[PDB]
Design a protein around this ligand. Sequence first.
Ligand SMILES: *[C@@H](C)[C@H]1/C(=C/c2[nH]c(/C=C3N=C(/C=C4\NC(=O)C(CC)=C4C)C(C)=C\3CCC(=O)O)c(CCC(=O)O)c2C)NC(=O)[C@@H]1C
Ligand SMILES: *[C@@H](C)[C@H]1/C(=C/c2[nH]c(/C=C3N=C(/C=C4\NC(=O)C(CC)=C4C)C(C)=C\3CCC(=O)O)c(CCC(=O)O)c2C)NC(=O)[C@@H]1C
Ligand SMILES: *[C@@H](C)[C@H]1/C(=C/c2[nH]c(/C=C3N=C(/C=C4\NC(=O)C(CC)=C4C)C(C)=C\3CCC(=O)O)c(CCC(=O)O)c2C)NC(=O)[C@@H]1C
Ligand SMILES: *[C@H](C)[C@H]1/C(=C/c2[nH]c(/C=C3N=C(/C=C4\NC(=O)C(CC)=C4C)C(C)=C\3CCC(=O)O)c(CCC(=O)O)c2C)NC(=O)[C@@H]1C
Ligand SMILES: *[C@H](C)[C@H]1/C(=C/c2[nH]c(/C=C3N=C(/C=C4\NC(=O)C(CC)=C4C)C(C)=C\3CCC(=O)O)c(CCC(=O)O)c2C)NC(=O)[C@@H]1C
Ligand SMILES: *[C@H](C)[C@H]1/C(=C/c2[nH]c(/C=C3N=C(/C=C4\NC(=O)C(CC)=C4C)C(C)=C\3CCC(=O)O)c(CCC(=O)O)c2C)NC(=O)[C@@H]1C
Ligand SMILES: *[C@H](C)[C@H]1/C(=C/c2[nH]c(/C=C3N=C(/C=C4\NC(=O)C(CC)=C4C)C(C)=C\3CCC(=O)O)c(CCC(=O)O)c2C)NC(=O)[C@@H]1C
Ligand SMILES: *[C@H](C)[C@H]1/C(=C/c2[nH]c(/C=C3N=C(/C=C4\NC(=O)C(CC)=C4C)C(C)=C\3CCC(=O)O)c(CCC(=O)O)c2C)NC(=O)[C@@H]1C
Ligand SMILES: *[C@H](C)[C@H]1/C(=C/c2[nH]c(/C=C3N=C(/C=C4\NC(=O)C(CC)=C4C)C(C)=C\3CCC(=O)O)c(CCC(=O)O)c2C)NC(=O)[C@@H]1C
Lengths: 172, 172, 172, 162, 162, 162
Amino acid sequence: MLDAFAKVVAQADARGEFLTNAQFDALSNLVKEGNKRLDAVNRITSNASTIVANAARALFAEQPQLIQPGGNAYTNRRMAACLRDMEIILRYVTYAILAGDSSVLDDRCLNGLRETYQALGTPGSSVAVAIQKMKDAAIAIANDPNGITPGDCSALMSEIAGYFDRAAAAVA
Amino acid sequence: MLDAFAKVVAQADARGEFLTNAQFDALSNLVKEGNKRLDAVNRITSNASTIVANAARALFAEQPQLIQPGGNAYTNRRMAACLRDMEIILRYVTYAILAGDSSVLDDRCLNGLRETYQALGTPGSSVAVAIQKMKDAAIAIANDPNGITPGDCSALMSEIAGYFDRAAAAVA
Amino acid sequence: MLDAFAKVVAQADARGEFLTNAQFDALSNLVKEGNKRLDAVNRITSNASTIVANAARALFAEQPQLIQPGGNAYTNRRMAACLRDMEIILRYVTYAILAGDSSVLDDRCLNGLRETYQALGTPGSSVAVAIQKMKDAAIAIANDPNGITPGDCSALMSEIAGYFDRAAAAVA
Amino acid sequence: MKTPITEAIAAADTQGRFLSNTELQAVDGRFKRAVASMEAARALTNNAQSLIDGAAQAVYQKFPYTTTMQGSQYASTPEGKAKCARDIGYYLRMITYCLVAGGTGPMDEYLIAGLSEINSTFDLSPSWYIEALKYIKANHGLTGQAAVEANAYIDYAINALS
Amino acid sequence: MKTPITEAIAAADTQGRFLSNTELQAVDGRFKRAVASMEAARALTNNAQSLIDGAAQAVYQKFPYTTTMQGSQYASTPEGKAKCARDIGYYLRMITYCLVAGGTGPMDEYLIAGLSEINSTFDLSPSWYIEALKYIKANHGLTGQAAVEANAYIDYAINALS
Amino acid sequence: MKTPITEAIAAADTQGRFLSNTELQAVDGRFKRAVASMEAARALTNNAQSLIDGAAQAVYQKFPYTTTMQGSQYASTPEGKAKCARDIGYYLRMITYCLVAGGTGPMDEYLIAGLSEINSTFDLSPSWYIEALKYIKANHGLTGQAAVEANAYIDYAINALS
Ligand SMILES: *[C@@H](C)[C@H]1/C(=C/c2[nH]c(/C=C3N=C(/C=C4\NC(=O)C(CC)=C4C)C(C)=C\3CCC(=O)O)c(CCC(=O)O)c2C)NC(=O)[C@@H]1C
Ligand SMILES: *[C@@H](C)[C@H]1/C(=C/c2[nH]c(/C=C3N=C(/C=C4\NC(=O)C(CC)=C4C)C(C)=C\3CCC(=O)O)c(CCC(=O)O)c2C)NC(=O)[C@@H]1C
Ligand SMILES: *[C@@H](C)[C@H]1/C(=C/c2[nH]c(/C=C3N=C(/C=C4\NC(=O)C(CC)=C4C)C(C)=C\3CCC(=O)O)c(CCC(=O)O)c2C)NC(=O)[C@@H]1C
Ligand SMILES: *[C@H](C)[C@H]1/C(=C/c2[nH]c(/C=C3N=C(/C=C4\NC(=O)C(CC)=C4C)C(C)=C\3CCC(=O)O)c(CCC(=O)O)c2C)NC(=O)[C@@H]1C
Ligand SMILES: *[C@H](C)[C@H]1/C(=C/c2[nH]c(/C=C3N=C(/C=C4\NC(=O)C(CC)=C4C)C(C)=C\3CCC(=O)O)c(CCC(=O)O)c2C)NC(=O)[C@@H]1C
Ligand SMILES: *[C@H](C)[C@H]1/C(=C/c2[nH]c(/C=C3N=C(/C=C4\NC(=O)C(CC)=C4C)C(C)=C\3CCC(=O)O)c(CCC(=O)O)c2C)NC(=O)[C@@H]1C
Ligand SMILES: *[C@H](C)[C@H]1/C(=C/c2[nH]c(/C=C3N=C(/C=C4\NC(=O)C(CC)=C4C)C(C)=C\3CCC(=O)O)c(CCC(=O)O)c2C)NC(=O)[C@@H]1C
Ligand SMILES: *[C@H](C)[C@H]1/C(=C/c2[nH]c(/C=C3N=C(/C=C4\NC(=O)C(CC)=C4C)C(C)=C\3CCC(=O)O)c(CCC(=O)O)c2C)NC(=O)[C@@H]1C
Ligand SMILES: *[C@H](C)[C@H]1/C(=C/c2[nH]c(/C=C3N=C(/C=C4\NC(=O)C(CC)=C4C)C(C)=C\3CCC(=O)O)c(CCC(=O)O)c2C)NC(=O)[C@@H]1C
């Protein structure tokens, strides 16, 4: 996998050249914003269970067919499996936030996922809705102004939304 | 895998409803006929070696090309493999008879079998003939009136023929 | 795998017949030429490292794009992997020479190789050039008149060239 | 799914052998018990509502806080009672499946697996359902083996909730 | 298939290494023995019939019950003797393949593997074939190494049948 | 690629768990060191040529035999010096990647892996490059942590060559 710095290094290595000033400024900028990234990972991580649960209730209330007998979330073992998936996606998302790159998310988690759900009969569009529900829950939790030193964090939240959106587009 | 009772339960669960009277009567009927099912499994099982052997001689005498040098049953390791397959099919068939459902037979044995023989060059139509030869041997042995309490067993023998026919159609 | 003798046996077995005089004469001929075969394997084997290295320098000097940053042989781990492949091919070639049959070469080494390089982005046509470079190096080393009892070895060298050519055609 | 019949077959299949006499004896044993177990399932099935509805109240009468305490995981709202009655049917339906299939397999696969995570995640009190079950164990008016078999799956359901 | 040459290669291949000197010496040894082994195979091949037909009778003369005892696995019927003569050729052909390939590999792959199951299933008496083999070991009029090598695969065939 | 950040994630991923506090503390530590490491990489990057060209000579001055000794793996020919200068840049570029990525990962993946085989195969003397490195360690005019961090990857490169 790669993190923000590693990706820039890999892009430069393939051209056999040293980093440019714009790349240095860009990596240095990420470092200066480091604390915010750590706060978002820490906040989303500490609330993981709440984000999944609330998103689950939201999804099923919006799509009652899934919990009807014979639907993909009926029975406790399938529901447990669905709640688990949501947690897996979230976990890998926090991974990409801490790294500042989506490689770990793509390589370990999104790659092939679409096919996996199609083979099981699990509706991908519905997984996307759950992923979108968690994005909004996670973002509101991470960008909450309470108990944190006031400052701009709008760039990070867009980056975080990107990862979730990117996860939803891999299964929609 | 599923047995007669399990399948009915699975069909009802998917509709989120309790069994109907027709389903109860049907399962109770199978139980009342239980001894016959046990006699068929016991009789086919005790004669397994004879059924395979006689069916093998029958098949090869009917299809002499298979035992010609260069045919799929030439050499003792291929013949041993062919006799083994016939025994595998039979074994799984007795499994389906004892359960009153073909799931174990389908899932463990018939699934993908067609492809497996095509990849090896083994003629599927010829495996079917062997499977058909065993059906007739097994059925005559299971429905023999000697040494058993006289009674109707015609429903069971049709069920048993179905499984064999179903195995032959998966490789023909 | 098969060696010269085994292949003839397999061809005869499939026809359910004993070897013909032409087959006996052919196998006996190979035996009479045995020492030469052993000298070629021994000579190519003892120089394996030199053949690979010289062929590598040749290939890269002829195709400078491969060693440019971002090319398939850039970085020491990819170059090490490329030198390794060349050694693998060579090793299996010496295997086929000692056996007088290309089965081991085909079955263990050439089978699927084309697909493997396509999936990695490694240019097959370039692997062929390296394989061709080794053929010429190996053959000159094996057919060198110095330090060996003078005699015709022209049949063996054609057989050896065939194996290399056959390896290059499997990835071109 | 687990049933006395399937276990027998799994045992012989894992050893690439034909069924044995003992396994055959086990299926016979299963058939002999099928009689009382089946009539138990029919009885319970015929007294669904009276049992389900009766089970619902037996839990509001012991956990009245679930009657109006605001919270989606509560029977405060009508939909909350709907969900609740739905779950009760699920339990009753499962025990009848067990009686029908001669074992716990049905209940293990469809309800027990993931049970804890499900109750934890949606904040459902295991005791709610356990009260339901204790009400059914003492209401199904079953006697003899029929009652014996039913109570077996009932207690089994209680364990898993504890 | 197993041959002195293939074993050598398998040994080096399992260790991802080029062939060693000892392995090369082993192939040389195989070539030196190839001479007498090959002429043995040619001799045997040139006296197929006299050996095969001669082997057939040498077993009816010691197991006459197979001459008319009703049963498809018997030489009572002409086709039964056909099958039997067919099998004899198979054995003779295999031993020549061994002499040709410098080892038992040919006979192990095409005839030995599954031998017992085949004889058990079709009810064939191993002794029938063993008598055949004892007749060939004492009929091939081979001498020196040629005979030495042949007898080796012959005895080897006897073992596997015992 | 290995970086303090990726290792942390690999550690939690291998245990199917969310990131821990200690791992978070490790990334913070990495960010604090990022400051001096980054300016080191910028400095080195701004004095490529003077360092590269200066490194080239520092090795011809200690291994003059490589100046005219016939042999493609030598700087006797102009292309030989081209190859050589190319390799020097490669090393300098890698150390800056390490400073940028907060670890050796970049240099391990692109240069260290297969290093020995590469030098053995093309007959390159590790000492040549080591002289280059000793020249850069004493030329980059870096001070404080910036110099501290650089020298770390420099020595690290020396080890791998020894
Ligand atoms: C944006 C997401 C929200 C926001 C963030 C914000 N956070 C800080 C500063 C700090 N964050 C931490 C947190 C950590 N440091 C760590 O080493 C670890 C790992 C254990 C964590 C979780 C710390 C220590 C600081 C600095 C001290 C402090 O609390 O002030 C800032 C200030 C950043 C800066 O350095 O300039 C900001 C802006 N602020 C918001 O309003 C968003 C809702
Ligand atoms: C139909 C296939 C043939 C046939 C069957 C038939 N069988 C019985 C009765 C019995 N079969 C058994 C056999 C077993 N019981 C076991 O527990 C086991 C496992 C070890 C076996 C193998 C037994 C005990 C009985 C009952 C006692 C008896 O032997 O009579 C019946 C009578 C069934 C009934 O209960 O009404 C019948 C009809 N009869 C046929 O004519 C077919 C050829
Ligand atoms: C053709 C490739 C070149 C050539 C070959 C050639 N070689 C020989 C003879 C011998 N080769 C060996 C080598 C070995 N014997 C072994 O058992 C082993 C394994 C450890 C090896 C490597 C030996 C012993 C001989 C015979 C004795 C000798 O050195 O003369 C011949 C003569 C072959 C023959 O028996 O008639 C020839 C022609 N000669 C060439 O000019 C080619 C360049
Ligand atoms: C009734 C005893 C009390 C009550 C119940 C209540 N339950 C839920 C929600 C769920 N119940 C389940 C249970 C199952 N699902 C299954 O597939 C099976 C096996 C067939 C079982 C046992 C599940 C999965 C849920 C969540 C998904 C869903 O809502 O369908 C709720 C809803 C909670 C909410 O919306 O947040 C309620 C209220 N509540 C009470 O107060 C009763 C005492
Ligand atoms: C929840 C929002 C939805 C849902 C989910 C659901 N998923 C499965 C089964 C599987 N999910 C995965 C996914 C992963 N496994 C991984 O290791 C990773 C990380 C790389 C991922 C993303 C897999 C592999 C399976 C199958 C294997 C397994 O069950 O573990 C199910 C089960 C389906 C079944 O039992 O047949 C369900 C129900 N279902 C929904 O209705 C929601 C929309
Ligand atoms: C002869 C010694 C006696 C005899 C023989 C007899 N054999 C068979 C049938 C079979 N023989 C074989 C043997 C082989 N098949 C092979 O591929 C190989 C290796 C190349 C061997 C050794 C097999 C497989 C069969 C069965 C299949 C077939 O019929 O071809 C029979 C026929 C038995 C029958 O039709 O039921 C007979 C009669 N019988 C004697 O009395 C001789 C003393
Ligand atoms: C006999 C009537 C015919 C025949 C059979 C034959 N089969 C094979 C090889 C294989 N058969 C299987 C099938 C199974 N394996 C299983 O585990 C199961 C249960 C799930 C089944 C159904 C497989 C996997 C193989 C290949 C692997 C192996 O050999 O074990 C052969 C061998 C072919 C060969 O050596 O290349 C033969 C000859 N052949 C006939 O001519 C009859 C018509
Ligand atoms: C310079 C210090 C001395 C010198 C160098 C020289 N090097 C080569 C050839 C190669 N160098 C490498 C090294 C790398 N390749 C990489 O991808 C990396 C990591 C990014 C490194 C460090 C390699 C792989 C080669 C061989 C392939 C190639 O030629 O590009 C040569 C050429 C040798 C030849 O053509 O045979 C030379 C001359 N020589 C000196 O005398 C200097 C003291
Ligand atoms: C060299 C002349 C060219 C070249 C080669 C190159 N190959 C790889 C990677 C692989 N090569 C193989 C091939 C084999 N593996 C085997 O075990 C066998 C024997 C049966 C063979 C033939 C495989 C499996 C791989 C991938 C797995 C691995 O790396 O071990 C690479 C690496 C590519 C990468 O890192 O992505 C390279 C560079 N490259 C060239 O430019 C030359 C033309």
